[PDB]
Symmetry: D2
Subunit: 292 residues, 4 copies
């Protein structure tokens, strides 16, 4: 499933930075019960950078196992080296995942032609649906609509997580692609506007802690009931912003701990513990959302 | 040492994308002959992103072997996961490399506290000198002077490659650190300016193909002969700019090939071959520098 | 009238840079016939900067006279000095204009409090409806939604021309103001997206030469027929962009001359004649729109 | 002359917002006493925007009178309409002012060709020396080095106030113009750096309240005593920054008042009185500089 509220799920960790199966199970049961459309496993919010390839694969396989067919799972498979991306994708072929979320290469700043060749190569060697992922603030490069248009002609490149927050991209891309290409926001604070302009859903950080409201908001949006969706959005907006008061996923992991959804808010370096000022800001945003 | 013209050396590859020893040997001999002060092995220009950890170490060890004590070798050791950075650093402990060049984590956007803890942890697991590396356009993260000041208090954190091209950083950092902390430009087009403001050298892409000019320019700068150095800078300025006409190291590898310095200009995806327009642009810049 | 397609009308000039009454009449008759909602007289596209206060007032009074009650006229009354703005407004009190369009002070970069006091003062000394105008790329300052919210409580501050192209501003402002506050795009290329998000119209440069299509597009948008409006938008999009290939109003004046709507494309310094390359680009955009 | 510490002088006003001669006289005497090299009258810090043309000329003539040949006076003559700039310039022809400071047109965003024609036209209507002024953050327009080079070929275009804070401009412009073209900083925080790179002085806001320190710092810089000059710069750096804590000249006028240099800190709308938090911030900065 590639519409509605899709959770960019945290990788819950114990005090030693190892994946906490009990906490992960609780999260997955929570999303099943709360109407989340799908789970993105080991994406940006899942600390993809600080898990090695084996750990990365373990978390995805564990998420699939715990999901037990009750909610679709999309694997984070992005890499800044084309060989690494292909290799990661091969690990998940025939795993039970429904799709892959694959970010533009970061740090090395490839050309648009390089992005084309990167994603074409990755798509060539799997039958899995591929969701492209653009987030220039993180990567140093910007996958432009023209190139998204080219890539969409590849059979199994079926959508994009557009995280710029630049809302003009919705219809610039939509115009260049077929009607079944999925446009998904990757920016919680502008996600409702993104849907109102033609987007089909959101891959959301806020959904980790406001799953039901996010699910309802996205359904109302899909139905054209924007004023109704916007009331929900207004109560989530502090959360949409303040979950980034310190680097994601620091705030959202702390929020999950505070709600009792995970056992510890531990991360891996270079992420560090939430500051006291950060706790207060996030707590206030949670209360505004009606969650505490 | 950590002064003068330091080359950000390409990793020359054969048509299959593997390191070409003959070409690497030719490059290192050229830098020895040219007066290059040191070599950064498997930095950004050396395609650190698309070499796996073992391949990366092999290239560094090969470069060190081929240098044969004639020219100091600095290993690229940056990673966006602290555990990976430590592991990479540990490979070169007691190896013969004189220091490490280590980039702020990319993609995951750590806070300034995260940068502090990341670089501190790394420095603690080695006796090797550490040169911090800031390049926000690639990483999505900006290591600020205040934090550089904090880190410079760690015994073996001894310098910074400052690639912002924001020249106010030179004196902002200099006032926060001791006189023996090295300030190196990571931006060829502004490097002479950077030196004129008190910088000690440059980790250069241009030096790959104009090693003798670059070495001489940095010498003049160190001696305070800025007008003289500027004449060289002006001859080199088209290269400083046009070596980024397409994503580095696509242009510089082609230039190396054109100059007969390497056998092939092959790269690894997502870097792709230089365009015809790029070739013509880079060739004109080489002609302007009097290298062709 | 403060909804639909509102034309940011050119001030047509003879070869000596003086207002050309015959050309102005032709433009005004064209907008009456073509379904334009209203005319903004001596706004940005009308060369407000290079008309002295007397010339400025003359053009507005002439536009009113030629309009002869067939189409509403809004006066550009913006100034970067509060006294100048008030004084300009007093000239038009009881003139027959329906409203004023008043830009944030430019060059002097006032605070949000200064913007508040500026616009409050101006509104205090007229009964005329006031439309605020935000265009940071021109002015060096940015009227934020919070301050728009404050100002909207002033009886006769009734809307905003939001020209950032930042589409998040639509609902950030809408949430803070009453349901009858008018939100108008000041960015042709993003104007349809702006309306789709809740905006009520556009103060348009493109409307100078594609009046009928703009009128229909905005009506379809107001009716919720976005896919239909978007077909029209796609054929105007080259024009939306290329009317800014050289500084506005250089391209649009040339376009009006080429269509026979005005006698000469003359401007005042510091605007200068369109380049040959500019003519070709604009001509191609006109043909794409079906206008030549 | 057009060298050293040049004050961007405030236009001190009485409570009614009109120029206060006694305060202006006190300021000019202070600059004479302090070693300030020249005064810019009714530049940006002098509230050029909110003085009408006659009021502006009166302030310039008053300043010139009060200077009484003891200190050179440069008139602010910029305008965004070329005809206005010429007219303002013509007021000071054969007056005793030694030159004009003329800003790129603001708001209307002319092309580089428009800048060329605007400044050329102005220079042609005067014998007075012309200092170009680039400050894109206020104007929406950026006068590039190439165009500065073009204009420097005009006999009486003799310098630039470069307020971008982008230090690469110093040597980019210097290589395009003759050795007697003056390079002046318009950015206090980076001005010493600007001078260290080859700039000849600064048109300073800080100099309003720290005239003696600024003059001495620029003298040391001109003599190549940069380390010595930096000690002064560091004492002044909080002022360099915090005089922009609220929009200039709100902070500097309050500082003048606090120091007893002017009778009131009154400004004209849209500038508004300093906030209490602003006062405390500016006072700490003055204390740091040892002026309080
Ligand atoms: N830290 C590296 C390797 C990731 C390993 C798989 N999750 C990166 O962010 O690309
Ligand atoms: N970058 C490699 C990818 C091969 C796939 C290996 N897992 C190439 O050029 O073919
Ligand atoms: N592609 C990964 C791993 C690099 C491995 C060592 N060169 C990264 O850029 O972080
Ligand atoms: N050129 C000045 C005066 C405008 C006179 C009235 N249109 C400005 O742009 O503010
Ligand atoms: N800026 C003036 C405006 C007065 C209106 C004169 N036309 C003030 O503070 O009152
Ligand atoms: N406020 C107008 C006119 C200034 C008149 C002379 N000081 C402007 O800033 O252009
Ligand atoms: Cl994700
Ligand atoms: Cl490097
Ligand atoms: Cl307008
Ligand atoms: Cl000034
Ligand atoms: K497809
Ligand atoms: K140290
Ligand atoms: K109102
Ligand atoms: K000259």
């Amino acid at each position: 499933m590639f519409t509605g509220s899709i959770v960019a799920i945290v990788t819950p960790m114990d005090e030693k930075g190892n994946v906490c199966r009990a906490s992960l199970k609780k999260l997955i049961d929570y999303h099943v019960a709360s109407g989340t459309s799908a789970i993105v496993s080991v994406g940006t919010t899942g600390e993809s950078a600080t898990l090695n390839h084996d750990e990365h694969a373990d978390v995805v396989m564990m998420t699939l196992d715990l999901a037990d067919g009750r909610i679709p799972v999309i694997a984070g498979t992005g890499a800044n080296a084309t060989a690494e991306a292909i290799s990661l994708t091969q690990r998940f072929n025939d795993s039970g995942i429904v799709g892959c979320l694959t970010v533009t290469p970061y740090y090395n700043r490839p050309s648009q032609e390089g992005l084309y060749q990167h994603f074409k190569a990755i798509a060539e060697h799997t039958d899995l649906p591929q969701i492209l992922y653009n987030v220039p603030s993180r990567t140093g490069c910007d996958l432009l609509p023209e190139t998204v248009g080219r890539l969409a002609k590849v059979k199994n490149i079926i959508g994009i997580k557009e995280a710029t927050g630049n809302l003009t991209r919705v219809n610039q891309i939509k115009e260049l692609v077929s009607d079944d290409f999925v446009l998904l926001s990757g920016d919680d604070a502008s996600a409702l506007d993104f849907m109102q302009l033609g987007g089909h859903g959101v891959i959301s950080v806020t959904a980790n802690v406001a799953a039901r409201d996010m699910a309802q908001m996205c359904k109302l949006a899909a139905e054209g009931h924007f004023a109704e969706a916007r009331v929900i959005n207004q109560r989530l907006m502090p959360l949409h912003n303040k979950l980034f008061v310190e680097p994601n996923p620091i705030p959202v992991k702390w929020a999950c701990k505070e709600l009792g959804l995970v056992a510890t808010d531990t991360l891996r370096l270079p992420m560090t513990p939430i500051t006291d000022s950060g706790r207060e800001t996030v707590r206030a945003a949670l209360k505004h959302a009606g969650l505490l």
